[PDB]
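Bench log, entry 3. Co-assembly request; chain sequences pasted below exactly as received.
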Amino acid sequence: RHFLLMEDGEFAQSLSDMLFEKLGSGQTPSELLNPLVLNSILNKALQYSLHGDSSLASNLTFALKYLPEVFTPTAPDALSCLELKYKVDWPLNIVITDTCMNKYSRIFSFLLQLKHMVWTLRDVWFHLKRTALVNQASNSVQYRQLQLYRHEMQHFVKVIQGYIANQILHVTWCEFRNKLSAVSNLEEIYKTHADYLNKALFRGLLTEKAAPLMNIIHSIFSLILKFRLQLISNFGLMQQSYNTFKYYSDFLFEVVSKLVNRGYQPHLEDFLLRINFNSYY
Amino acid sequence: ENQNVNMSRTGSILKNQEDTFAAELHRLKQQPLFSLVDFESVLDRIRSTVAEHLWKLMVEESDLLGQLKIIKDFYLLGRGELFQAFIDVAQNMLKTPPTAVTEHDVNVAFQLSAHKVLLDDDNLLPLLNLTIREAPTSGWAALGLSYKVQWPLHILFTPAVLEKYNVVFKYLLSVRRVQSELQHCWALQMQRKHLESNKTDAIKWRLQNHMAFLVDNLQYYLQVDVLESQFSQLLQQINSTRDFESIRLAHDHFLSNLLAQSFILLKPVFHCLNEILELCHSFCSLVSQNLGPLDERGAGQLDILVKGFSCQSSLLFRILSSVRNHQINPDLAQLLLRLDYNKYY
Amino acid sequence: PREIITLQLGQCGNQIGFEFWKQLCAEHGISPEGIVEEFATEGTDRKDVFFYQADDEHYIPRAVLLDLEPRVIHSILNSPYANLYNPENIYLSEHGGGAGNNWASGFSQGEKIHEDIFDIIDREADGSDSLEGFVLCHSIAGGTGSGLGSYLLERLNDRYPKKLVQTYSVFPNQDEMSHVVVQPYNSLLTLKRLTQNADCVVVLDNTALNRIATDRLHIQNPSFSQINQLVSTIMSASTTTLRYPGYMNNDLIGLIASLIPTPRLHFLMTGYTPLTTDQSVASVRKTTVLDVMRRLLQPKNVMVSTGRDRQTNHCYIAILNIIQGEVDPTQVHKSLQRIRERKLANFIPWGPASIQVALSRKSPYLPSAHRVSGLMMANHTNISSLFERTCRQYDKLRKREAFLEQFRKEDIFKDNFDELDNSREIVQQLIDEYHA
Amino acid sequence: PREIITLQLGQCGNQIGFEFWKQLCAEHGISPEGIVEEFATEGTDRKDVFFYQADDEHYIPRAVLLDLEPRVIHSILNSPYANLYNPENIYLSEHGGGAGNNWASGFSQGEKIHEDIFDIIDREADGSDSLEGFVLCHSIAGGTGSGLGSYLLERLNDRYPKKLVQTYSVFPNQDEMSHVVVQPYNSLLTLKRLTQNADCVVVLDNTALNRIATDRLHIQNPSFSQINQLVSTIMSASTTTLRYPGYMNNDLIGLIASLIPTPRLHFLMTGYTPLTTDQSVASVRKTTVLDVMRRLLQPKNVMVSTGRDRQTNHCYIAILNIIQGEVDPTQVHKSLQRIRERKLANFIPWGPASIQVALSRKSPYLPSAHRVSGLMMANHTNISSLFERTCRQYDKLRKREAFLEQFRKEDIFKDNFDELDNSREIVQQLIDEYHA
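Structure output for the full assembly:
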């Protein structure tokens, strides 16, 4: 739970610093020393937060996969191509199987891209940080309505991720240990642990691993790079880019109304929270 | 045999009924002939000691007396205030023809309504959900309740008879709503600043003293006398009988008495009673205009209703002649006359 | 949900509401400064209907108490039940008032403290998003409760138009006219506001109090310490369907809706029999419900001074008979069986009548779960005898040149005396016309 | 890593930060002079985020305390919590100051001790190679905390440009103007520096303190010994995601980023309900999370003096609702379910709003692991009522010829009074313009 579900967030906050070491892909080396110094700095990141012994640190391993990011050659990512690998050891093999580690790589890569959104979204607040940088507190050419659509952008993302975080973590941790232990039904554990993990991916987004909701979390990721490149570098090209976000956010609202069925999907009501918020204003 | 083997009715893994049963078996076998008394007197012994051990099962595992007053409070509406806040909120968003998403919406509304009340048990709240037809005209008088039940209490509650509890449940909330709607359109004309001193108000006003006096009487002396001395003999039987089916079919005679008093007659009186609650429902929507009794439409809509209100007292008068000229039903006659000397006196 | 704000006002209205809140803690199983008993939630299924809802299981009373006289509130803080009251909802320490004895004093003081009187009493209004209404627990006797109470019956009629108004008002005493002489003036000015600016009242006569206070209570010198004992029980008796879990007419807009025939006819007769503590030794033998409502319609427990030979041409229209606690409900329909045979209530010849009976379980307490209690809320058309008594004492005083020069110096420029006389006769004529 | 340097400054800022560090040892399970409990590492998973990192398991506070008055620091060394403080980080024994009561005193004393004030407070900056920022735990009341605090808001803006600035500043009291009369002058001079030379503030009103200090705390004579009890808990409550192990907005640049709409609109309303010790006897029955956030948006726990009838044309934009300790997180989405049905927060018609809820486990302690706690960080656009209150008390004083000859003798040659007036009205106009 502390290193795959990230409820001791010091490791995933240190993952943001590992997300602060990539900054776009691909521009990274393709040597064999590229796994050698990158597998280390994640082991060094645990001592950077001062938590845990080396007894559980042998259960964490990191496998740097290879996928092209300049898309003809390889220069592998650490926003979605850096994966934690949990280990199978000598007594504990009825808990961990190969199917559950397949989805551990799915969960670890899915937090790592939404955390890259939220971290780089606050990196822009570092760009305009006060001495002053960017200036013109309201005038000249816009900052008053510029930062008005930028903060209602960072409004919606920061409250989506908090609601996705609350549906992943809490009831699953309330269902898990307590229930399993008390049911003194403890034989053949991986027929229950994999069902717990299948609920844990049911609760995240689950998308039947095929729905177009995964295509919208990519398009709203596709504007946050567009959001960060215009602020590192355009004011008219700015105001078009967030109208495209407001088109895509309203596109994200109308598909949710098509998933509607009834009495189903505890995120669907939580999405309909904001829809009835959107009606009263 | 399904759930757990130490929970047996006869005593089979856990008790020693079986050796006595085997001795009875040797005695029965030793007989070349057959008769009726010897076969059936020991049909007691394979039943009666078996019919008491499961009674001593379900007392301790469940707190029997707990849910079997709780399930009646959801259907016969013992917690009367605790559903009116649901009815007030569910009225303002069942104002459509029903669709399939309104099932989930009315559900989470009953959730938040029973939650702000502070029930004494938080987990008693999500034990049910609510269910509702396709799209007849309206959501009211088409909704229901699903209170599902755990281990072996379900042999006392077959999935047939929860529909028999749910069918009067939508009828008893219908006369909570039309009682409270007559309680609110009354509540608009309390002061002189909303009251007109015309005679069109005075002909509006003798009707509600006839009609709002009905549902505070007809649905009271029905519903309170249905609950009190039918709950009285159940609690006195389960405290005085160590037997299973005699307790069980006595609560079957319990439910069939509640759904007979509350049904009074099949076509006429149930059509007379729903015609009562429709005709005072337009007395809500007539009063609900701004300064009602001074409008021409306030007296124009009224004139149809002064016919239909005496269409209902005179149809109530037609049943009383069938109650006096009497070969039909005593519990029908004792209740309907009890409101009638509470009417004509 | 069903939150009611009580408006305790005046010299007599503050004392009758002080023991009304003191009665509520003994039946809820709670202490005014703590919670020492667990009987509050298992025995009582609803507590947040007159109290404010809890923040630390401390059920704050939803009460406001204003009076010109500081003597009624200085006999409160030394009592150990005043810590339940809050010193920020109404007043802090050292609150005062006028000099003061006038109907025109509090009628003119309402618009000079108009900013403060509509500031702190409205903070309790938005605590619940569905407010029940307002009860003006005020007085008619004196100029303190009658002068300022007539002002709030007007400005709360339009600022809160969709709320129930109904008061438990006490009538003054008409035995001699030496200490007070302004009694016919301040009473009829408030009585006009009680019919058109108010929906319902609950009358409580003073000359009928000492009829009961020497009936079974056996006192020799009548003091003011007995006026709070008959009043505080029937106040908590009227909310037994509302406080304790009931089913039908479990709201205050439930009970009053089934008894009022028409506006300006809302004066309800009250009756309450059991007030004796030595009845307790013989209620162990199953004293039934068949004998407790035979004496309610019999004019013995009434709190209204009315004529004894004027009941033959008057007719009951609505009569309430509330049983509490142990009812034995298998014979409560048997008690209503015997009503039609006597015809102790004269019925209206134009329309139907109604004898409504209801029940609710009382507090888990030994004097409450043992002795039968009967609360009556009648409505009989002989109530014009009090209105004939007050009007005959009103026009006789204006021919003696009494308080016509001593009363019109402040804020009175025109003769509004016949404005009260005709509207009182409108009530007295429409009552006798109501039975055609 | 995430090290924050607190800048405790002034007569009131030093006392509110003294018990802030004293609160932290009782929840970390540590003593100011030793380590006697093992609950510091097994129960608390992170301790080196406000303290300096350990050399002998002695978590030094990262604190500096400067004041002109030596009275606030002479009441420190006799207390047994001062040995945790170091006598070489800030001052040694017998530290002094000015005479002294002026806004122009500390504004002119900043550039004469300019060498020493930027020498020993920068030694704690390079201890961690990734500094979080600076919080100015200063005061607005008096000339001590307002005079010198306006200087460090300018010179730390460019010497440390990539650091977060955000302050927990206390507002002065506006009841009478006899002891101090320089209150409209020194407040508005610092309030200009709090908007353009500072990113965010956390407002803490003084007239709203005694509204709460007599609400449930029941005092008769208001002393200064109660001002540290409401302030030190909500300071440690604001860092529960930062001190205790949380996941989202676990940094100080996490929480403030999700609430500020725009620069010069950063004044956050604070709320905190549970302050009563006799609530503890009834929290054993599973008091839930469904009732604790219904009263946060209800204006009862607020620490901001604002208008009650001005909330209909004003709209909430960002509201934070922090639950701590035992949450029962299977119903925390159930508490957020009931928010849309009431609409107790008015939403902006131009853009979306957000009700953010978060949780973190509290200290392993019996009053902390039993009672539910709710910390509110609101942002409502009715905060211009305080800015209308301060500006109306500012222009009225300049027409009375008050402190125009007594204030411009030292280091003031031009009229900078309307430089503060227009910039305050720029804040008041852009707030109402923000909801189109």
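The longest strand of chain B covers residues 128-131. Chain B touches chain D through nine residues (CB under 8 Å).
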